[PDB]
Design a protein around this motif. Sequence first.
Motif: not given
Lengths: 267, 267
Positions: B59, B61, B90-92, B105, B112, B116, B119-120, B145
């Motif tokens: 995870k 940042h 990627e904890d965006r 994104y 990203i 990545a 993501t969330n 993804r």
Amino acid sequence: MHKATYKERAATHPSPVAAKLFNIMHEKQTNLCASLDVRTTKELLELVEALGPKICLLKTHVDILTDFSMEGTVKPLKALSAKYNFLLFEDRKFADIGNTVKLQYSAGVYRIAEWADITNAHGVVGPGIVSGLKQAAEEVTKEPRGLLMLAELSCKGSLSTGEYTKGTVDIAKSDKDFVIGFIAQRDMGGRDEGYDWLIMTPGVGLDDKGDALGQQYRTVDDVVSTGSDIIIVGRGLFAKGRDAKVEGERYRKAGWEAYLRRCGQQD
Amino acid sequence: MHKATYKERAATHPSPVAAKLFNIMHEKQTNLCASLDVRTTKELLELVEALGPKICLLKTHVDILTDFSMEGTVKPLKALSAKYNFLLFEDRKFADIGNTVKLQYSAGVYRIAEWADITNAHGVVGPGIVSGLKQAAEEVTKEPRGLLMLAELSCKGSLSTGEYTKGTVDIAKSDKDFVIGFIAQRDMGGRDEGYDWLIMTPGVGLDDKGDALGQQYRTVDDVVSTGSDIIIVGRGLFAKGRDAKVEGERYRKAGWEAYLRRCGQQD
């Protein structure tokens, strides 16, 4: 039943950044916020140069830029901001807390808190977003910063319940020194309890139909008479052949007249 | 009353990225996600090199990095990701819709979606975030993804009500091909309706007290027996003198044994 004039609110407001914005609005006779979502710095800077005299605020998305750089984009932008006297609002919509949002706001590649006078945040995450962002701001500049809360969302399927909206308004009350107001479609009240929230509203047109692709649907006079303090206009100012300078004056005049007219209310 | 094995879920899962992560977890015998919030690329890459063999997911940042670059940070990270077989998350915490999130994104400085795997996103914004991020992904890579929804927040003062959590779970159901699961502390159900959500839970320790500064408080066995599929561990892996390689194996084993023990349940 209306609100005080921008001049009076600037003198009373507990937030330095809001007092500064209100003074800009009164000085330049504008409550128009430009939203220029272009992909290159060149485009942005050219458009901003043209709207500079007609706006009180610029809503930006530097993270949408294809060639962002502190030297190539921020440096020149701050120059225009100082030259034409308008503030910068980075529409990042923060939705995190703790050390992570502090850094996403103050550091990284964009270093937002270093140049953006104003930003916005979601309420779901709790009051920790307000204190987090506030502290992060205090650490990177001596310059005044402010936050706008997103208490009510207009997108379809939003989970922005009345209970959610009240929860976010409650968070905004955390401190009127930092939280400046809301991005909203109507008045959020608070005058009874000693809060003077800035209401900034997007989706505004002179052509209600939706002539501008910036997603416009309510008229300037509509929102301003509804308690809206700032009108956010996007594509309608530069889209399809329109002269940014001509449209900026067109919306500025519409907004300011609607405001003066609102100052003439009594109910 | 428990869930199927990771191997079985990999074979049945509608999401390519979820099937891929389940296979990594079974192959390497890990359900450990490393959270390395350092400020330099050098630190990150060294730590990732050390934990690589022991994790199924990292995870990140990158927007916290003090020296991010596609060539200096992403290129080497993907190399490690492929070399040691683990995915990048990627904890965006995206909280916007339309063309703006699509670009936040897929483009900008971080790009990203180009690297990545996962993501969330928050639920307040409505299902438009799911479709927007999905489409943006399809436009920049052929690589699978996945998205994790944040249905229930644990911070103090969060407006993450039961009604809000149900609204976000409902958005997750928009499509099981893209939305992989949730960042949560407990099971979010859905097995009755044919959904196999991946539950990733932060704040885990072997030392409940809070010995690790990554903000750990529930034990690995505690969460894994509660239906948690992946354990997210941060500071407890490299903080204060600890040898990342040693701590990685420590948590990996605790997590894997808790899982095997869970497969031994019947109720």
